Amino acid sequence: GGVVQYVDASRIVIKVNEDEMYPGEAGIDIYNLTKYTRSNQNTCINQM
Amino acid sequence: TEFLKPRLVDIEQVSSTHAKVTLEPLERGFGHTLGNALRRILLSSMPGCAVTEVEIDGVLHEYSTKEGVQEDILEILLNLKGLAVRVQGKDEVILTLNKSGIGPVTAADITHDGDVEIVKPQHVICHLTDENASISMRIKVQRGRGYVPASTRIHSEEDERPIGRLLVDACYSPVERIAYNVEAARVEQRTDLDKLVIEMETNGTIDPEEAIRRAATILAEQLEAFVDLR
């Protein structure tokens, strides 16, 4: 859990709450989204 | 002979996109005929303006993203496809847009033009989510009628296009819904008359009276061939 610090069409950064952090980490989670990738059936895979 | 010809009487204006018109003098049976003909013509052949081309700085194709923009290029093009623009005096104009900072990018941010009016300034185009984010677009608006897919405009071409010019499907018609009703008239001399009420739903950019008169002109121009000797 936390608060959305940065949001983009291909990237999301979450600022983790201090109650869920570890003692020696910056406490940020980065999610990179797959955009317009080929599937096994030659279809489109896209995350928004 | 005893044919009481119709005349435009009243034009209520419910909203910016909703209006009603009335034609009071009608003989028995003419109301439905004219209503159906006018509905078909209004739904089929009205002219309008639509976006046909978009160019964005640092974008090569529609299957891509832009840093600091929450929407994909495809979603931005779809949003631009629903932009209502009224153009007077010319059949082709190029608009420009520039914006910076964090916030939505609405139709009000388009650079002002002398002979171009934006009917709905609150139409959201895209959102910016970074303080250093910026966007710049060159939007081309044309005039036409019907529905012209871009995959058909690519066929009708003899000169190549540079990389970065994004084509958009054009929906020229400004009319969505048409509904008509026939009700009895209030002429005391003849209690066998009826009036035709036509309800229109548009996106602006068109005047109801002008649309009705254009439909009538098209119908008469079509009937000119039947009227003649052959």
Curated annotation (Swiss-Prot), chain A:
What is the protein's applied use? Co-administration of salinamide and rifampicin or salinamide and myxopyronin suppresses the emergence of resistance to both antibiotics.
Name the source's superkingdom.
Bacteria
Query: What modifications does the entry list under PTM / processing?
Result: Acetylated on several lysine residues in the presence of glucose.
Signal peptide, first to last residue: none
Q: Describe its partners and assembly state.
A: The RNAP catalytic core consists of 2 alpha, 1 beta, 1 beta' and 1 omega subunit. When a sigma factor is associated with the core the holoenzyme is formed, which can initiate transcription. The rRNA transcription and antitermination complex (rrnTAC) consists of RNAP, NusA, NusB, NusE (rpsJ), NusG, SubB, ribosomal protein S4, DNA and precursor rRNA; S4 is more flexible than other subunits. In pull-down experiments interacts with CedA. (Microbial infection) Interacts (via flap domain) with Escherichia phage lambda antitermination protein Q; this interaction renders bacterial RNAP resistant to transcription pausing and allows it to read through termination signals.
Function recorded in the entry: DNA-dependent RNA polymerase (RNAP) catalyzes the transcription of DNA into RNA using the four ribonucleoside triphosphates as substrates.
Identify its protein family. Belongs to the RNA polymerase beta chain family.
Official protein name in the record: DNA-directed RNA polymerase subunit beta
The species this protein belongs to is Escherichia coli (strain K12)
Taxonomically, what lineage is the organism?
Bacteria, Pseudomonadati, Pseudomonadota, Gammaproteobacteria, Enterobacterales
Q: Which gene encodes it?
A: rpoB
Q: Covered range within the whole protein?
A: 721 to 768 of 1342
UniProtKB/Swiss-Prot annotation, chain B:
Q: What is the reaction catalyzed?
A: RNA(n) + a ribonucleoside 5'-triphosphate = RNA(n+1) + diphosphate
| Effect of mutating residue 40 to C | In rpoA112; temperature-sensitive, blocks RNA polymerase assembly
Superkingdom to which the source organism belongs:
Bacteria
- Record keywords, A-Z: Acetylation, ADP-ribosylation, DNA-directed RNA polymerase, Nucleotidyltransferase, Transcription, Transferase
Q: Where is this region: Alpha N-terminal domain (alpha-NTD)?
A: 1-230
Q: From the UniProt record, give one GO term of the biological process aspect.
A: cellular response to cell envelope stress
- Might you report a single GO cellular component term? transcription elongation factor complex
For this UniProt entry, which segments traverse the membrane?
none
Q: How is it modified after translation?
A: (Microbial infection) ADP-ribosylated on both alpha subunits by the phage T4 protein ModA. ADP-ribosylated on only one of the alpha subunits by the phage T4 protein Alt.
Instruction: Give the first-level EC class, as a single word.
Output: transferase
Single GO molecular function: DNA-directed RNA polymerase activity
Q: Could you say which EC number(s) this protein's record lists? A: 2.7.7.6
Region of interest (Required for interaction with Crp at class II promoters), ranges: 157-160
* Family listed: Belongs to the RNA polymerase alpha chain family.
Known function: DNA-dependent RNA polymerase (RNAP) catalyzes the transcription of DNA into RNA using the four ribonucleoside triphosphates as substrates. This subunit plays an important role in subunit assembly since its dimerization is the first step in the sequential assembly of subunits to form the holoenzyme. Part of the processive rRNA transcription and antitermination complex (rrnTAC). The complex forms an RNA-chaperone ring around the RNA exit tunnel of RNAP. It supports rapid transcription and antitermination of rRNA operons, cotranscriptional rRNA folding, and annealing of distal rRNA regions to allow correct ribosome biogenesis.
Q: What is known of its domains?
A: The N-terminal domain is essential for RNAP assembly and basal transcription, whereas the C-terminal domain is involved in interaction with transcriptional regulators (such as CRP) and with upstream promoter elements.
Subunit annotation: Homodimer. The RNAP catalytic core consists of 2 alpha, 1 beta, 1 beta' and 1 omega subunit. When a sigma factor is associated with the core the holoenzyme is formed, which can initiate transcription. Both the N- and C-terminus interact with different regions of transcriptional regulator CRP. The rRNA transcription and antitermination complex (rrnTAC) consists of RNAP, NusA, NusB, NusE (rpsJ), NusG, SubB, ribosomal protein S4, DNA and precursor rRNA; S4 is more flexible than other subunits.
Output this protein's name.
DNA-directed RNA polymerase subunit alpha
Q: Which organism is it from?
A: Escherichia coli (strain K12)
Question: Taxonomic classification, please?
Answer: Bacteria, Pseudomonadati, Pseudomonadota, Gammaproteobacteria, Enterobacterales
Q: Which residues of the full protein are shown?
A: 6 to 235 of 329
